[PDB]
Ligand binder design. Structure first.
Ligand SMILES: N[C@@H](CCC(=O)N[C@@H](CS)C(=O)NCC(=O)O)C(=O)O
Ligand SMILES: N[C@@H](CCC(=O)N[C@@H](CS)C(=O)NCC(=O)O)C(=O)O
Ligand SMILES: N#Cc1cnc2ccccc2c1
Ligand SMILES: N#Cc1cnc2ccccc2c1
Lengths: 198, 199
């Protein structure tokens, strides 16, 4: 099965797919485009957004729809429907938070006040809730890794670029990052991947 | 006895996808609707402090689309194949992305208005054109059977029509899809009895 991933040269919304491909040892083409390439490409995609994943000539879209697809019938999804629900919900909670950042905002001044608010006022509420949900479990769902844990590593990696001191009082969430990053396939991907800010 | 209690505001909003699925699958639930002024008493009781949630034997499930997808598992509503389930999820996410751009809770009523009007007059046409192109001449988004993506279009389009009643004038196939969803007997009976709210 030929897999062609297309995104910008960053971790961003494609990175969850990249982790899953790494974890499952599935070969794929990691196609990256420059900002100035994008207007020519945007009209050629069904919903004019990236990432997209081409699978056997079919173009799939929506980072989380694709990630979920790739984890189907694996433990990464959650082993039961109830667990799948919790896994999906943690991912969506994280994605909701990351989606508040005004990434394309041109007013640099406004972007900065909003970012600072997200990182200093709002993030502690989210982090507290993630910490309370993880509790003393090894992984978000309990005793096995899911793509929610991947997504926490991914989101926290960007959050830490933006605010390096953010996880001061959440040792459990730092342990979870560390557990994800020590998974041999993930560790090899992290070492290997292009070094981008986002 | 195990039962389902849905907690949300007295709105369609993000709970309505769950309500359609429950109606369609004939799943019994308590449709608990929170007045805005009571919300701050309830927020502390929910693990992630947001609604909707579904309270079930022990657990509190959260995230509208996580819950919706859970209720469709092993059901044709999900999509019949893994691939189709991906397409279903993706359409739902595209609609959710767009409804999520609206600054629903914005205090600055002048800003709120400019953003709503920009979304409805500038951005919406691109999304509608893409959804219409995706649907093409198919009976339903996925092909020949209804999925929760079609339900989610009915729901999103209902609120979008409240905000801009002429939004769908040039997209007859998207109107047709709303009509087909609304004509499903369990959906039609739910629409008939649901509380009349703006959102
Ligand atoms: N929820 C979607 C969001 C897709 C999205 O908006 N992607 C951005 C890049 S992070 C994009 O396509 N930007 C270009 C544009 O909007 O034209 C997903 O996760 O795939
Ligand atoms: N993506 C989440 C969003 C949940 C959300 O933010 N819900 C709003 C109401 S539409 C809420 O809980 N607002 C009250 C608050 O944040 O205190 C979902 O679909 O459940
Ligand atoms: N630029 C950018 C960007 C946009 N959305 C994201 C969502 C989740 C994680 C990282 C993200 C980065
Ligand atoms: N207030 C509000 C509100 C109403 N309807 C929604 C539909 C989809 C997503 C978010 C929504 C928020």
């Amino acid at each position: 099965p030929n897999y062609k991933l297309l995104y910008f040269n960053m971790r961003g919304r494609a990175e969850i797919i990249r982790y899953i491909f790494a974890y499952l040892d599935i070969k794929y083409e990691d196609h990256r485009i420059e900002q100035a390439d994008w207007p020519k490409i945007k009209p050629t995609l069904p919903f004019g957004k990236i990432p997209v994943l081409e699978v056997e000539g079919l173009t799939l879209h929506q980072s989380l729809a694709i990630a979920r697809y790739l984890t189907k019938n694996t433990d990464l999804a959650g082993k039961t429907e109830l667990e799948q629900c919790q896994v999906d919900a943690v991912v969506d909670t994280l994605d909701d938070f990351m989606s508040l950042f005004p990434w394309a905002e041109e007013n640099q001044d406004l972007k900065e006040r909003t970012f600072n608010d997200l990182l200093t006022r709002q993030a502690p509420h989210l982090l507290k809730d993630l910490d309370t949900y993880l509790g003393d479990k090894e992984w978000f769902i309990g005793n096995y890794v899911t793509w929610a844990d991947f997504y926490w590593d991914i989101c926290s990696t960007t959050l830490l670029v933006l605010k390096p001191d953010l996880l001061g009082i959440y040792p459990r969430l730092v342990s979870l990052r560390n557990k994800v990053q020590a998974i041999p396939a993930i560790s090899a991907w992290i070492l290997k991947r292009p070094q981008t800010k986002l």
